[PDB]
Amino acid sequence: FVPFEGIKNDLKGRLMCYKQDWTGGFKAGFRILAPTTYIFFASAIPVISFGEQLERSTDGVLTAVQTLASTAICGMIHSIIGGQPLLILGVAEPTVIMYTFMFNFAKARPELGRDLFLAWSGWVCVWTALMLFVLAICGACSIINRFTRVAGELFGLLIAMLFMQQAIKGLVDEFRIPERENQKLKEFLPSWRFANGMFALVLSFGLLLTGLRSRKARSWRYGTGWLRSLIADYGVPLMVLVWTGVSYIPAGDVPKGIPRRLFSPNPWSPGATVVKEMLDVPIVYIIGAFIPASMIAVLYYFDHSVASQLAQQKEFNLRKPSSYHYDLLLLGFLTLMCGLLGVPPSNGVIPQSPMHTKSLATLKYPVEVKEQRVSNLLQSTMVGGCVAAMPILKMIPTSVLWGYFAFMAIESLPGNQFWERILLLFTAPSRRFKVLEDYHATFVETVPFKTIAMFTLFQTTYLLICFGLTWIPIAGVMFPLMIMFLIPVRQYLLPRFFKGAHLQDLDAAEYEEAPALPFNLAAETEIGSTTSYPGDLEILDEVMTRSRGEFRHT
Amino acid sequence: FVPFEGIKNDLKGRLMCYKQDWTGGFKAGFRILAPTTYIFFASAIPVISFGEQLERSTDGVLTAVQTLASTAICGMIHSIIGGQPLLILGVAEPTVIMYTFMFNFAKARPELGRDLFLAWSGWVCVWTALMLFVLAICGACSIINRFTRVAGELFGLLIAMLFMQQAIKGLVDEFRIPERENQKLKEFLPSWRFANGMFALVLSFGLLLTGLRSRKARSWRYGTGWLRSLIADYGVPLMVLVWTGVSYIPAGDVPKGIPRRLFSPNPWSPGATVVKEMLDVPIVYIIGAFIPASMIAVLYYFDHSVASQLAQQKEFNLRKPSSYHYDLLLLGFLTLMCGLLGVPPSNGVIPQSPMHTKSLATLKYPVEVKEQRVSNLLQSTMVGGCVAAMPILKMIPTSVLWGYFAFMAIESLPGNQFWERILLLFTAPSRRFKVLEDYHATFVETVPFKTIAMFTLFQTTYLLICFGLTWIPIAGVMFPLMIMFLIPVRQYLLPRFFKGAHLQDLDAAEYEEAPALPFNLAAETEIGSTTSYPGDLEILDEVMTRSRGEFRHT
């Protein structure tokens, strides 16, 4: 933990591959645009959704303009002078939640109010930048190996819960009058409001289901290869466009605001740095900003490092070194800059970074990744240009964004072992052989079900407590402390209750899977030792057709 | 083809097992109620949907009351004095289409009009009864072995197309003012109409998707066995109830008719035999009724026999004989009775009859079927009692019935080989190995793809021509003739163009399936000889998690 050692080593390592980092990007030619566009679409849409969320949560102080600007500027700076260009930066949901807490605190205090919210947030960002500088200089990133699966998966499920909560919140508001809108408009009559709510339900569920189906296009037996890849890569934006077009079908027979569209304003309209108002904040609140700043620094020190680790998985066979410490230092500087500019800070986001690395990967029949600084710079510049295209983006209905929130919530589940363990916990004892008939984790076979159940119950209790804490008006801004407390807990307390190899299998740093087992081998196991025979109607359901009741012959 | 031989033989066979047919039903005790209730729900809901369809198509002359009454009375008579009690009778979609054609013909002719439509239909039913008597006496049912798969599957797909068309028709009308309603009501304002249409979309799609998911409950690893069986058996009625309840959520904040509910009237209200008006029909039209009567007799002679055959599949190991000829004779008598009473005739329906037989089946570890006349009688009496419960049924929204129409359309597909062949025809040449990696028909391996393609193209052209003919105002009532022409076509013309075993495999009376093949064996085949290797992103999609981009280790 020698000060400045990690930063110096990272800088020495990354300074030998800068010119190559650029030339290899230019040598790829126009073929570098496909990963660029893919990651640009993967980054922009969630950022716009978070911007709308903030617009609703901050009474219009922060909108999609600010989130897009922060994402673009931070991404460009990271691409040019950052250590690991594979890392993708952007505004994330936890930052939105923290800023919502801060806004709610400031609004109820006359000394700050809505007019000094951004100044107080700038002071918070100054504190966060200092904390991140200290963490990077002291080499705190040398212990990121202790950021085990138990904390990451719990945080992911918490963020998925919050995504779904936001989706439900928005869909319920689609039936209500907005707070800052003229209540006398025809679009806000009870009939038109009910119609708008129903149309929002239709559009949101359509987007969600169609995108979820599109995600598995490359496995279809239909169409061309390029068409299947196009669907699998750009389904989300394609479905957003399709459902916007659908929303425009009744445009001629309904009022202007049916369905409701994005509330974020257009920056080009004449109606439209916070350092000047920063001096006006009372000293007591300048000092008190230390409190949320510590939580934000915790969140960033976790998320940045985890995203970089995921983007630098050893299976990619990357040949260039890592820059964790210098990356955290630059993140502190970027947070200071964003606080001074009046925009929310950005940080490493998941799964955008590993998806970018994958988009830059090819197999030599064996993974080889094309690492360079051009794709990140171009995608960040496109995210920035999206600000100028705000008139076009304002045509998107809000229900589509709520559907996208639900989409992210559901997409956080697939590879999450905590979710699989919850499903197993709620599974019937006589139907676990079914669990054993498909791809499954190894701890299902190597760990007794009682220990899995106890571990999952502890994890679920922790998750529910954190979710409930998020609902407390003021104390809810402490949930990153609860997230970090899982490190010492896993390191010290769990070994007392759990026995070694069981913990290692249940909290493995590597995703270990197992292939499907034959039915005969799925019963000799302890977990599948309570196999019950199928019923008569269960058997007949499979040997007779549903269309005409015809017996199938095999 | 000796006259009265088949009827006499069937009567002699079925007269030796009547008392046992009843006693075995009474000996089953209260356990006979589960199949009874299952088949009652399987029969009632489509009949109510057809009743609403007729109400919209006949300007209120025929409604769900008449369809329910016909189904109940015919089922009871068949249960008591019928030959094969496993056969389930009811009003079917083709009868609805024929009656719609007849109503449209009568309305445009001042000599008949809406006031003599039922009388003309009674004369049509008299002609149909005479035709069926002739067919049964002459032993025309001795050649039902020529009702091959090519005709049955084409007819099924045509009826599925018509189901989906009715669903779309109803959902579009949910946005419009009904023809015979007061246009000044608040519920028919543009805003409330748009809201009603959107709510109808929501409810219909919810019903459809939830029912389709419920159909596969017995294969779940969750819940109890009895709960899974309950879901798999009663999902459709359960989801109808659930979505009706959902429809009642905004009842306090919306006008009376939001959402629209069943239009069929309640027979108990004071506002509410056609032999008297039958004498008033002109002689020319009495004679002309011969034309639609022949088509209806074709439809019934096909459907009754096919449904009985499906209910009497040899795999059920039934120990009692068949009564095809006497069943057709009784169907003629029932059609005469229904025409005299002013209700549409009923006939054998699919897949209700084989599903009833399956519900009466148990495996002795080997199928053993409990054949008796109690379940059919009880379910028919319950269908009849549903008439008295019309006030409760009128609470169902029409959008739920349109969703059920779409549900039947989609449920007609699974075991249909014509649909599978269409999908194969539109499949990519390089992705047929995927077809070979799952359960598939044998002709995929035993027949070249060119012959399958030609056969499927001919069948699809025939189907589309029949569907288009259904759209012609008057000539569309001839489509049963097109259906029957497939018998001589298959028997005489196809062998000229197709070569023996290929036709036998493509038009086998038995549903022949084949198990999944290994990838190595799926390429040596001629059809799977154009296997293309997966792409880099296709490979990476499977080895990395979608939630966090984590490499999977196997």
Residue numbers in the entry:
A (entry chain A), B (entry chain B): 5 to 276, 281 to 373, 457 to 645
What's in the article?
This regulation is achieved by borate transporters (BORs), which are homologous to the SLC4 family. The Arabidopsis thaliana Bor1 (AtBor1) transporter from clade I undergoes slow regulation through degradation and translational suppression, but its potential for fast regulation via direct activity modulation was unclear. Our findings show that AtBor1 is regulated by two distinct mechanisms: an autoinhibitory domain at the carboxyl terminus obstructs the substrate pathway via conserved salt bridges, and phosphorylation of Thr410 allows interaction with a positively charged pocket at the cytosolic face, essential for borate transport.
Our 2.15 Å structure of the wild-type transporter is solved in the inward-autoinhibited (IAI) conformation and reveals previously unknown detail, including C-terminal (Ct) domain swapping within the AtBor1 dimer. The TM domain of one AtBor1 monomer comprises 14 TM helices that form two distinct subdomains–the Gate and the Core. The gate is formed from TM helices 5–7 and 12–14 and provides the entire dimerization interface. Phospholipid molecules can be fitted in those densities, indicating that protein-lipid and lipid-lipid interactions are also involved in dimerization. The Ct domain interacts with the transmembrane domain through conserved salt bridges and obstructs substrate entry from the cytosolic side, rendering the transporter domains in an autoinhibited state. This revealed that the Ct domain comprises two α helices (H11 and H12) connected by a loop, followed by a rigid hairpin that deeply inserts into the cytosolic cavity of the neighboring protomer in a domain-swapped manner to block the permeation pathway like a “plug”. Our IAI structure illustrates the molecular basis of an autoinhibitory mechanism in clade I BOR transporters.
